[PDB]
């Protein structure tokens, strides 16, 4: 079977913790008063909550409450456990309240408000410096939550609220995230189709923090090429084949060998052979302004097949690539 694999950072963070940080499902909710909340407008159904822009009127502010739909005891627990133990967290999306919606009969996850803009409209504007600028941003998120011992596992530009007047961003939809613990194998069924990692979508279980570079390098990738998505599969299988005709099928290969993982046999008709490509096929003269050695050999140290082998979150803050953003 497969070759065991261990997170090469932040591996026995959770191990060291009292019981009480990681084990979720004792984790007893302090319920706060749901009149305090008035719901305002629905923005929208996704698939694990209803959400509303509403008025704490407590205070007079704006917040987003998402009410959830039915689902285990289990991963309401997780998400709230999760939030609490990131609230204050650079970047990290505040919960501001838990409160027992009387409709639904389900919890309402009550959080700070940002002003966002539609990240399609959003990644049409964005200079290079906004680029750099934000991926830092997303950086802090992603190696405060690794250090703290959880993976979001759904990194991707619905998840980044970004007020862009203030240049304030915010890693949100913490629904999916989980603790880290070296050797658990965990659900492959996680992020969304685009920004999965070679992992899942191998259905190798021991992932780690790495899945969450592999989403960041996909962000990046559409994001320096103007390509929307980056990897645009038609389905998790196609999926494996969008990458491996970028990043090529040997090293597709020399992965799965290394893991001792068997590609599922439906790809034997459908993979073929690819040559790894080299990252200036993707340039044009509508995106070379957005592109640069710099930003060209960060975003190939994010996508590499082997999670092992990619950027943690610490590494890539450390990149060239981030040299001319303005640091506070």
């Known amino acids: 079977g497969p070759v065991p694999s261990r997170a090469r950072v932040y591996t026995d963070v959770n191990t060291h913790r009292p019981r009480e940080y990681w084990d979720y499902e004792s984790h007893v909710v302090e319920w706060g008063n749901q009149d305090d909340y008035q719901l305002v407008r629905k923005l929208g159904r996704g698939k694990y909550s209803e959400v509303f822009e509403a008025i704490n009127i407590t205070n007079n502010e704006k917040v987003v409450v998402k009410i959830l739909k039915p689902v285990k005891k289990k991963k309401i627990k997780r998400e709230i456990k999760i939030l609490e133990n990131l609230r204050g967290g650079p970047n990290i999306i505040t919960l501001a309240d838990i409160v027992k919606d009387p409709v639904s009969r389900t919890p309402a996850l009550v959080f700070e ?9 959003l990644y049409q504007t964005l200079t290079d410096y906004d680029i750099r600028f934000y991926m830092y941003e997303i950086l802090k998120a992603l190696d405060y939550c690794h250090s703290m011992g959880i993976m979001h596992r759904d990194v991707k530009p619905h998840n980044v609220m970004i007020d862009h007047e203030h240049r304030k961003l ?3 939809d913490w629904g999916l995230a989980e603790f880290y613990h070296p050797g658990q194998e965990y659900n492959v069924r996680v992020a969304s189709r685009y920004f999965k990692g070679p992992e899942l979508l191998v259905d190798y279980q021991m992932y780690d923090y790495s899945l969450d570079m592999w989403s960041l390098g996909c962000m990046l990738a559409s994001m320096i090429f103007r390509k929307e998505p980056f990897f645009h599969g038609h389905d998790n299988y196609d999926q ?15 992965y799965i060998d290394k893991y001792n993982i068997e590609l599922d046999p439906r790809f034997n008709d459908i993979l073929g052979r690819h040559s790894r490509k080299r990252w200036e096929r993707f340039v044009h003269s509508e995106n070379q302004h957005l592109v640069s050695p710099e930003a060209l050999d960060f975003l190939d140290k994010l996508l590499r097949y082997d999670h092992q082998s990619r950027l943690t979150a610490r ?7 981030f040299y001319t953003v303005v640091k506070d």
């Open 113 to 121: 408000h940002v002003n966002n803009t539609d990240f399609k409209q």
């Open 240 to 254: 494996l084949v969008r990458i491996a005709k970028v990043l090529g099928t040997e090293d597709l290969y020399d």
């Open 170 to 172: 915010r890693l949100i």
């Open 315 to 321: 590494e890539a803050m450390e990149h060239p690539y």
